Amino acid sequence: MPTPSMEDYLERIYLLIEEKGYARVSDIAEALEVHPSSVTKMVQKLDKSDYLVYERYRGLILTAKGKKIGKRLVYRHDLLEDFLKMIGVDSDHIYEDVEGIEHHLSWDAIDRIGDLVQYFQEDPSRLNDLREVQKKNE
Amino acid sequence: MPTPSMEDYLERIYLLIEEKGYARVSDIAEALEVHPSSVTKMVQKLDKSDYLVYERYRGLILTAKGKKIGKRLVYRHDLLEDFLKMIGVDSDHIYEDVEGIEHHLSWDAIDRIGDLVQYFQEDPSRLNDLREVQKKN
């Protein structure tokens, strides 16, 4: 039920607390280069749905459900980037490819990509076999 | 240069042409589930910039530019469809995953996914191994 942008907010809030222990509306407005009123509008939508609370002095605080979602999105990002690096996407394209597909994949496809990323590591000579296919095509 | 919308039209037009020599506007409207009036507007944009021509009592033909683009777009859709099947996405989310992602991947990524699909075709025991990682979970 959360929109993609709502997920992006919860992940960004989780990562602000990872960075300095607190998440501020001004932090998000500055990182996004948007007006703080659009951040407070999004925060209100996340509050109303019990993904976070706000207290004056402590700032934005994730609920159990909000923190569950934020962490999952960090992991999905890490997983998709592992995948694209494994198959050889160059450093010019990999960041926007990860951002591009992370909200347009079913969790089924995310899980299947996870199995793929695990497969190339359980016997890492699989990765060298893959690199050789790419070399042969050049 | 071609927008996502243009690409969606070019890909469908190429599929009809490769199958029937010409793409009819009526077939394009039903396939894309848009009103014929929207197709007409898109056709005039593509005609004016030389992606296609309209031939009376036949339909649309792609120019060399339009054809080279529509071919590459069909390849991308087919490769992503193959890639998702191969890694075990259920058949009842495949269509939605392909359309959700096809406008969001560099051609660099498409090429590498091609190399990946090729890796699994050159030795079909690789796919059996992949399946054992997934059933073990």
Residue numbers in the entry:
A (entry chain A): 1 to 138
B (entry chain B): 1 to 137
What text does the study give?
The manganese transport regulator (MntR) functions as a homodimer and is activated by Mn2+ to repress the expression of two manganese uptake systems, MntABCD and MntH, in response to elevated concentrations of Mn2+. The MntR homologue (BH2807, BhMntR) in Bacillus halodurans is a protein consisting of 139 amino acids, and has 78% sequence identity with MntR from B.subtilis (BsMntR). Each BhMntR subunit was composed of seven α-helices and two β-strands, which could be divided into an N-terminal Helix-Turn-Helix (HTH) DNA binding domain (domain1, residues 1–71) and a C-terminal dimerization domain (domain2, residues 72–139). To further understand the metal binding site of the MntR protein, we determined crystal structures of the apo and manganese-bound forms of MntR from B. halodurans.
